[PDB]
């Protein structure tokens, strides 16, 4: 039985979060949690909370045991961009995109 | 279109396509290039072509057995149920009834039957003769129509 | 055993039993057709070469199906000259099954 | 449908040719023909149907006229001013196998398959080869 958790509208570009997601795809959850603990990225903190939520979901809702679980699927989709104005020289305005991401983790036995 | 006649940006130097009016039909919110105005769509019909068409229509109704001539057609009271029963007795459903003189009882009885229409002979029109399945004419109506078309 | 015959302005090398797609013949389905002008018959090492046709050589076949082949698109386009034209085409065929080869 | 040779069922034989006294270009055309497989009824443009050919005595290949002294092989190193040249006689002295290899390469198709065809040519300067295991048949060009 697959169990999911998501962080929707996470404040990071998908590109940055995908660097971390690729580390744990297919790993046993115990190994995934260790990898994320010693990955020095903001995205490792975000992804670790989603993985921990997916594990808690699997145990509480679906009656799984943590020992059997692997990270079966993980993917990051692009969320809505927040549009902001950045003043540049000579009265010119640039658009800043503050990109967001939707992080999905699927764990299963 | 409501708005200023100000040129949106200078002719040269901005690197944009040249603009003249915010109301240009190229622009969102701009004018319609060939904006409609109210129109009179009515056509001339030559009197003889009108009359010729009616004679063709009436002749075709006779050939198709859609013209039914009666001596009289009337109802006792202005009651829809009476006219509905009368048309049931005659095996009529979708019918134009043309009278020599339009009875008030028959007018009122026919009004709420959408399949039925009651006219005087002077108020015939080409579309109505074609549109209804059957046309019932009183003897007096036929004479007035005869006299009208000749 | 195989034989070579002409049909539909083209030539075909056939054996008994095989189905052959030809240009359309004006012959109803189910009917037999005889190809009288056989160019070659090879049984094994016995090889009869027509000059141009093998004397007494006949191929018999049954008309199995008529039909239209796959659609091909004709595209004509003259760049910068405001000219483009398209057309579809499906070629008629007759499938025949070879029933007998007789030298 | 017309027959096509299949790479994984092609029959390729081994031959050995003696270049001694043979005219370079008239030898090369026959090698090129056989490396391509133009001599086989199963010839297919996109498939290497050709044969393996050992060429012996490449240093004794012949040329007509004054070509031994006057035929020049040019190459550029890719460095500016790096145009280099060698005469036929200089090539025979330094690197005799290259004379036949260069002649044949220019007569083979250009592209991946032509390069694959060239790999079947085994050119030797002298009278001995190491391919007795392939059992090459003598071929008189």
């Amino acid at each position: 039985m697959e169990t999911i958790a998501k962080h929707r509208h996470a404040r990071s570009s998908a590109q940055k979060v995908r660097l971390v997601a690729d580390l744990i795809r297919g790993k046993k959850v115990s190994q995934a949690l260790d990898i994320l603990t010693y990955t020095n990225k903001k995205a490792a903190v975000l992804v670790k909370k989603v993985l921990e939520s997916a594990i808690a979901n699997a145990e509480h809702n679906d009656g799984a045991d943590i020992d059997d679980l692997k990270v079966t699927k993980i993917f990051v989709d692009e969320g809505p961009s927040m549009k902001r104005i950045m003043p540049r020289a000579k009265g010119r305005a640039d658009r800043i995109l503050k990109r967001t991401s939707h992080i999905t983790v699927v764990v299963s036995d | 279109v409501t708005g200023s006649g100000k040129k949106p940006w200078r002719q040269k130097g901005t690197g944009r396509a040249r603009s003249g009016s915010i109301k240009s039909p190229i622009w969102r919110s701009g004018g319609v290039t060939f904006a409609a105005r109210p129109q009179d769509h009515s056509q001339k019909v030559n009197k003889k072509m009108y009359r010729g068409a009616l004679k063709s229509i009436l002749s075709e109704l006779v050939r198709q057995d859609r013209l039914i001539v009666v001596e009289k057609f009337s109802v006792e009271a202005p009651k829809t149920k009476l006219l509905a029963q009368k048309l049931k007795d005659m095996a009529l459903e979708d019918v134009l009834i043309i009278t020599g003189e339009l009875d008030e009882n028959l007018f009122l009885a026919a009004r709420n039957l959408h399949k039925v229409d009651v006219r005087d002979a002077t108020g015939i029109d080409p579309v109505s003769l074609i549109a209804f399945d059957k046309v019932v004419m009183t003897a007096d109506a036929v004479k007035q129509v005869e006299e009208m078309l000749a | 055993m195989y034989a070579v015959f002409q049909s539909g302005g083209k030539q075909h090398r056939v054996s008994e039993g095989q189905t052959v797609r030809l240009e359309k013949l004006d012959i109803a389905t189910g009917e037999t057709v005889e190809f009288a002008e056989v160019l070659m018959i090879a049984n094994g090492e016995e090889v009869k070469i027509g000059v141009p046709f093998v004397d007494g050589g006949v191929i018999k076949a049954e008309v199995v199906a008529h039909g239209r082949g796959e659609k091909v698109k004709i595209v004509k386009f003259r760049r910068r000259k405001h000219y483009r034209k398209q057309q579809g085409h499906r070629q008629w065929f007759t499938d025949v099954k070879i029933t007998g080869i007789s030298a | 449908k017309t027959f096509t040779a299949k790479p994984e069922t092609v029959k390729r034989d081994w031959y050995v040719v003696d270049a001694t006294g043979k005219t370079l270009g008239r030898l090369a055309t026959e090698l090129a023909r056989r490396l391509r497989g133009k001599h086989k009824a199963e010839y297919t443009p996109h498939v290497d149907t050709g044969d393996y050919i050992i060429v012996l005595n490449a240093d004794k290949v012949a040329v007509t006229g004054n070509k031994r002294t006057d035929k020049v092989y040019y190459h550029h190193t890719g460095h500016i001013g790096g145009i280099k040249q060698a005469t036929f006689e200089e090539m025979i002295a330094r690197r005799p196998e290259r004379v036949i290899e260069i002649a044949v390469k220019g007569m083979l198709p250009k592209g991946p398959l032509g390069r694959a065809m060239f790999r079947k040519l085994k050119v030797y300067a002298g009278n001995e080869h190491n391919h007795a295991a392939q059992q090459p048949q003598v071929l008189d060009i």
Partner: protein, 48 residues
């Protein structure tokens, strides 16, 4: 004789030209005006 069985006489209703609706029409692009000059222009042409 019904409102959906009446037809105009053959030849009585020719379709109007519609310029500038693509190659196939035969009036695409320049709309029968040719190339450039006063007569190609909107409102273009000389007086009687």
């Amino acid at each position: 004789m019904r409102l959906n069985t009446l037809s105009p006489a053959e030849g009585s209703k020719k379709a109007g030209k519609r310029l500038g609706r693509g190659i196939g029409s035969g009036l695409g692009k320049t709309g029968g005006r040719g190339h450039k000059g006063q007569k190609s222009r909107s409102g273009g042409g000389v007086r009687r």
